[PDB]
Amino acid sequence: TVPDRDNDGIPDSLEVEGYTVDVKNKRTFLSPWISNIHEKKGLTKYKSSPEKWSTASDPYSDFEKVTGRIDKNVSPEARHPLVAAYPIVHVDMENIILSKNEDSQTRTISKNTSTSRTHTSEVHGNAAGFSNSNSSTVAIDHSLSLAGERTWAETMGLNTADTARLNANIRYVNTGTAPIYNVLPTTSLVLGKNQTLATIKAKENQLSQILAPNNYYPSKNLAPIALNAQDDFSSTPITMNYNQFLELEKTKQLRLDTDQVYGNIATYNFENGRVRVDTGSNWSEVLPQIQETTARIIFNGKDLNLVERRIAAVNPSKPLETTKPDMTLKEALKIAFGFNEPNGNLQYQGKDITEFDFNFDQQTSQNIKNQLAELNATNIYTVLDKIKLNAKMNILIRDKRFHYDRNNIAVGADESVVKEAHREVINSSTEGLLLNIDKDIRKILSGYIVEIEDTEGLKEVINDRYDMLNISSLRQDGKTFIDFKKYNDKLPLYISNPNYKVNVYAVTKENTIINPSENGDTSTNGIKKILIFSKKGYEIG
Amino acid sequence: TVPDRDNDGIPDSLEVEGYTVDVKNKRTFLSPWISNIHEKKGLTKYKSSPEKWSTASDPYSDFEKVTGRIDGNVSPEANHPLVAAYPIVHVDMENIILSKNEDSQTRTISKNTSTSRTHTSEVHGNAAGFSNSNSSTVAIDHSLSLAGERTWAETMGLNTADTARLNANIRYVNTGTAPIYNVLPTTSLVLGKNQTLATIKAKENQLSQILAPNNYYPSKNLAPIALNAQDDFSSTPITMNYNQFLELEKTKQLRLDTDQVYGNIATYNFENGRVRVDTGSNWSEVLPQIQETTARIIFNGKDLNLVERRIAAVNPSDPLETTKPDMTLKEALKIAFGFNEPNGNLQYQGKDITEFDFNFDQQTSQNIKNQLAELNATNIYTVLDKIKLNAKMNILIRDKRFHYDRNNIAVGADESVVKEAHREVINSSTEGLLLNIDKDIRKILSGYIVEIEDTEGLKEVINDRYDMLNISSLRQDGKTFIDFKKYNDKLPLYISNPNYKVNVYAVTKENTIINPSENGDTSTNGIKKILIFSKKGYEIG
Ligand SMILES: [Ca+2]
Ligand SMILES: [Ca+2]
Ligand SMILES: [Ca+2]
Ligand SMILES: [Ca+2]
């Protein structure tokens, strides 16, 4: 006869005042939080809403989340009652291949790509800020693989009356916290600004495979999915005219907008413990309610990729959402991403919180500036355990070192960081070098520039082209390999004197050029470089 | 037990004499209005009718509305029992392209448009005004984009025996208070008076996406819907013969009549709280009942766009509609739109109520003139808390400063406020002008006319063309930019004497012309202008 308004299984007083789940001899017990006998064993103090069946409005209950009777692919950070469990799938593009529409063996362009999940922010000054849909922008390689390939349009033989067809290899990736079971979304390939070339639509129930969190659908040891290469019934290619081809060759960038139609939800069944796809549940019934009653936080501290989580905060207008527990910013960071306090300081695996850069949108900036004024403080890193969150807040934590473009991708840091990151030299040789460059710093480097300094000092650039900076490689053990052999007619570096200096430069992605310049510049004159490597000729060998 | 006739969950005496929903320890509590302890916390005193399950006849209950057990996309002012929740969706047209029906790279004409929701009233005196329909008019840009493009019919190269095709990019927009979930409406494109060119019937349930209030269906970071472009199952073009092309070039105006077929309603499910689209409920059942038992009020204070809200008022001939609470005009403005009285004066974000203009239909003007007669007063702005509202009224609150056309769109103000709007100069030069013009004032300006004055005084107009007035540009920092270089062959203002005077004119949207006059008049001779700018040539540098 205890009260239970929401029918999840936990009585109301437990959900308000704190509860925990403990395993005795082998059985599980759900008991209230008694501080002296529970903190010792290392248990977690849960708090929930006594009037919602799921506090984060996702399809898994509070009981099912804390007690483990859940579909086991739900990510471990989403087993808290206040972290939402929902999938976020986008499309990753491996490589494209461009042919002319009908001896065509050396008349195709086959390039590698690079796809990243984007979070487009406010434009600076001459064009709720952060919007909720899955989109990724690819970046086609501008370097050369064939020794004498040039001039894409004349490489193929494209004229103004001709059309060009496109083909590519894609694979999906779920970076959220819940699995997708049968249906895959319908992404669309936008070129330029609004010019949709095609809508990539997978066949319905052509799979029965699960798409678990942090996993790819054609797995990394299988073959990718090719756009419209199957032909047969779908012999409809992806056609571009001449103007669109010129726009693609100028910009060298596409965009893949993915929608949010997923399948059904697989639910635990209390009789025999079987997880089975429920045709009564659906993700489209849940995703708006997740998006309206939770606070979004985006973070890239594990690697330079954006990771989105949502945390169930209050909304002071509705009385049903004033029932959820109070959520400070510190606790949200601790339960959602994995920060900790080893000695008092909130850090993320060594990196302190003061090395990250808080960026809100408009409404959140107003909302937090009011709290900072009423708390009488100016440093947000001091009062991080008093900033209350509310619903529809958008926060964006990012690393302070690098510089980010309009889509919040790291495109190149300060020069002092790049110089510091190249201080570990393992092997020096006439053919190449070996360094221990960090994984984070090596994301933002577009390429390298090699030139020879005389004893007096001169400048002769071996790879003196915009599309010849691709020399660097990486052995899997953890050691990169720069290569002078690649653009020196497969002959080693011409050490004319042992008292010379071999100057190597680095260029970040915000400074590189991907096209020929205005008049004729296929040279590295107008490219900003950073001094990286300058040693004598007799310390090389 | 307590009496509860309507069977929603609130007892009768509470609904008649006032109630509110308080949150104690963490649980919610529906209580009568205790004036001592509910006024301090800032709660709202609700009132409803004890015999209607939904007082504003919309498909959400009174209980569901006050307690927060509602769809979270329902607009926040429609959380009151006395404000109806229903969608008002129309079509926004972005840009059109016109070409001849079949080398067509310069045989086309591409223009940007401007779409606004209309509220067509009666003609002045020489032909009850307000009716229930969603329609918007577009305004194709009459000015030029290239250097010397002219003469639309000769630009496309048409004769009397030619037909032209039409293609455009549209976007739906929901400005009501409730969302649509699967179905999109079926608009029709009307040229002139009744010449329907085509009916847009974008296929239902090829989407599953939501059209939330104050949001667009292909969202602003996606690509728009193209009219009849892809041809997948659309083998018919949008044809237009020569006569209709002549009227289109004469008018440069269309019309988009959108009907009211929407999908189903998503309702709260009390066992697990899942908001799920119910196949039983439907908006077609609800919308006439909303339209017969409420009193609409149209307002354009936030910007110069019309916003329609409906407030549940009594109807004295009906015994079930004498159950609803008494609604005054002040309370309707306070709960529907967001007016407040800080000191005792009803004002909408600083602007006092006396800055707005009241307009009724015939029946409402009779009904309100009788109330002013029996109240013994002549000023409606003084007795605004004693004007009772009844059902089927129609009020139109609009801004006093402007002048409105047939569709109640702001098309011009008086001269004095236009001169006052341009007295903030950020930077002045011979290249352009930097100003802070207010965003509402700059919505009624069609373009500018620039000219140079002699030291004795002469009249030399630089851009002396009707299609060469678009010399204003707006940057995202919030500051406009006039530009002399646009029609001076990319060359700055040729000042001949530093003691000259520069004169810039402004032409509003009611005074501009879209077609040259009867003989050949591409001149700006008979165009009513306004003195904006008069400095010297030695002060702009
Ligand atoms: Ca409970
Ligand atoms: Ca609960
Ligand atoms: Ca009742
Ligand atoms: Ca009622």
3-state secondary structure B190-235: EECCCEEEEECCCCCCCCCCCECCCEECCCCCCCCEECCCCCCCCC
Which residues hold their Cβ within 5 A of ligand 4, which is an ion? B 6, 48, 62
| Residue A205, CA distances (Å) to A62, A91, A276, A287, B72 in order | 32, 18, 16, 22, 32
Rounded CA separation A310/A292 (Å): 10
Rounded CA separation B47/B328 (Å): 13
Rounded CA separation B446/B18 (Å): 52
Rounded CA separation A75/A452 (Å): 53
**Partner residues linked to B507 by β-bridges:** B447
Query: Which tokens sit at A101?
Result: 């529409």
Contact call for residues A313 and A294 (beta carbons, < 8 A):
yes
Query: Which tokens sit at B100?
Result: 């001849």
Contact call for residues A235 and A162 (beta carbons, < 8 A):
no
Instruction: Give the nearest partner residue to A7 out of B79, B271, B274, using CB atoms.
Output: B271
**Residue in chain A lying closest to B28 (CA):** A319
Task: Please give the DSSP secondary-structure letter assigned to residue B340.
Answer: B
Rounded CA separation B292/B390 (Å): 11
- At A501 the three-state DSSP class reads strand
Which residues, in sequence order, are CB contacts of A213 under 8 Å at separation 6+?
A73, A74, A75, A87, A174, A175, A176, A177, A178, A179
Instruction: Give the nearest partner residue to B28 out of A51, A53, A127, using CB atoms.
Output: A51
Residue A434 phi, psi (nearest 5)? -130, 130
| Residue A519, CA distances (Å) to A215, A516, A522, B85 in order | 46, 8, 9, 61
Residue B118 phi, psi (nearest 5)? -115, 155
* Residue found by looking up tokens 């339209």 in the block: B291
Query: Which tokens sit at B205?
Result: 């349930």
Contact call for residues B455 and B394 (beta carbons, < 8 A):
no
Residue B62, annotated as binding a ligand? yes
**Could B219 and A5 be called an inter-chain contact, meaning their C-beta atoms sit closer than 8 Å?**
no
**Residue in chain B lying closest to A61 (CA):** B272
Residue A61, annotated as binding a ligand? no
Instruction: Give the nearest partner residue to B221 out of A6, A12, A120, using CB atoms.
Output: A120
Set of chain B residues whose Cβ sits within 8 Å of the Cβ of A325: 26
Residue B521, annotated as binding a ligand? no
- At B466 the three-state DSSP class reads coil
* Residue found by looking up tokens 């202008």 in the block: B529
Contact call for residues A265 and A282 (beta carbons, < 8 A):
yes
Report yes or no: B169 at the A interface, CB cutoff 8 Å: yes
Kindly report the number of other CB atoms within 10 A of residue B299's CB atom: 22
Element (H, E) at B248: helix B242-251
**Could B221 and A133 be called an inter-chain contact, meaning their C-beta atoms sit closer than 8 Å?**
yes
Residue A467, annotated as binding a ligand? no
**Could B28 and A261 be called an inter-chain contact, meaning their C-beta atoms sit closer than 8 Å?**
no
Set of chain B residues whose Cβ sits within 8 Å of the Cβ of A259: 209
Rounded CA separation A9/A17 (Å): 15
Contact call for residues B381 and B303 (beta carbons, < 8 A):
no
Contact call for residues A494 and A503 (beta carbons, < 8 A):
no
Would strands A187-191 and A109-112 be described as parallel, antiparallel, or unpaired?
unpaired
| Residue A516, CA distances (Å) to A287, A305, A465 in order | 46, 30, 9
Contact call for residues B469 and B446 (beta carbons, < 8 A):
yes
Contact call for residues B529 and B449 (beta carbons, < 8 A):
yes
Task: List all residues of chain B from 59 to 88 with a beta carbon under 8 Å from chain A.
Answer: 66-69, 71-73, 76, 79
Name the residue among A497, A416, A516, A402 with its Cα closest to residue A458: A497
Would strands A295-299 and A394-399 be described as parallel, antiparallel, or unpaired?
parallel
Task: Pinpoint the alpha helices (H) of A45-151.
Answer: 62-67
- Tell how far the Cα of B59 is from the centroid of ligand 3, in angstroms: 15
**Residue in chain B lying closest to A260 (CA):** B209
Task: List all residues of chain A from 127 to 146 with a beta carbon under 8 Å from chain B.
Answer: 127, 131, 133, 135
Task: Please give the DSSP secondary-structure letter assigned to residue B87.
Answer: -
**Could A57 and B273 be called an inter-chain contact, meaning their C-beta atoms sit closer than 8 Å?**
yes
What is the DSSP annotation of A71-90?
A: -TTS-GGGGSTTB-----EE
Residue A308, annotated as binding a ligand? no
**Partner residues linked to B100 by β-bridges:** B164
**Could B274 and A59 be called an inter-chain contact, meaning their C-beta atoms sit closer than 8 Å?**
yes
Set of chain B residues whose Cβ sits within 8 Å of the Cβ of A317: 76, 79
Rounded CA separation B485/B430 (Å): 9
Rounded CA separation A183/A175 (Å): 16
Element (H, E) at B23: strand B19-23
Instruction: Give the nearest partner residue to A289 out of B25, B28, B72, using CB atoms.
Output: B72
Report yes or no: B403 at the A interface, CB cutoff 8 Å: no
**Could B476 and A57 be called an inter-chain contact, meaning their C-beta atoms sit closer than 8 Å?**
no
Our CA angle for B298, B303, B307, nearest 5°, is 25
Residue A322 phi, psi (nearest 5)? -95, 5
Rounded CA separation B363/B473 (Å): 45
Q: Going along B247-342, which residue ranges are E strands?
A: 253-258, 265-268, 275-278, 294-299, 307-312
| Residue B429, CA distances (Å) to B423, B460, B480 in order | 16, 19, 14
Instruction: Give the nearest partner residue to B219 out of A5, A52, A131, using CB atoms.
Output: A131
Rounded CA separation B238/B244 (Å): 12
Task: List all residues of chain A from 252 to 281 with a beta carbon under 8 Å from chain B.
Answer: 257, 259, 261, 281
Q: Which of B21, B25, B26 to mutate to test the interface with A (most CBs of A within 10 A)?
A: B26
Give the amino acid at B68.
G
**Cα dihedral A506, A509, A513, A515 sign:** positive
Cα pseudo-dihedral B267, B270, B275, B281, rounded to 10: -20
**Could B23 and A49 be called an inter-chain contact, meaning their C-beta atoms sit closer than 8 Å?**
no
Task: List all residues of chain B from 172 to 211 with a beta carbon under 8 Å from chain A.
Answer: 208-210
**What is the 3-state composition of chain A as percent helix, strand, coil, each rounded to the nearest 5?**
15, 30, 55
* Residue found by looking up tokens 């004007």 in the block: B387
Residue B22 Cα, gap to closest chain A Cα (Å): 7
Rounded CA separation A315/B227 (Å): 40
**Could A54 and B272 be called an inter-chain contact, meaning their C-beta atoms sit closer than 8 Å?**
yes
Declared resolution, Å: 3.3
* Residue found by looking up tokens 């005004």 in the block: B129
Report yes or no: A236 at the B interface, CB cutoff 8 Å: no
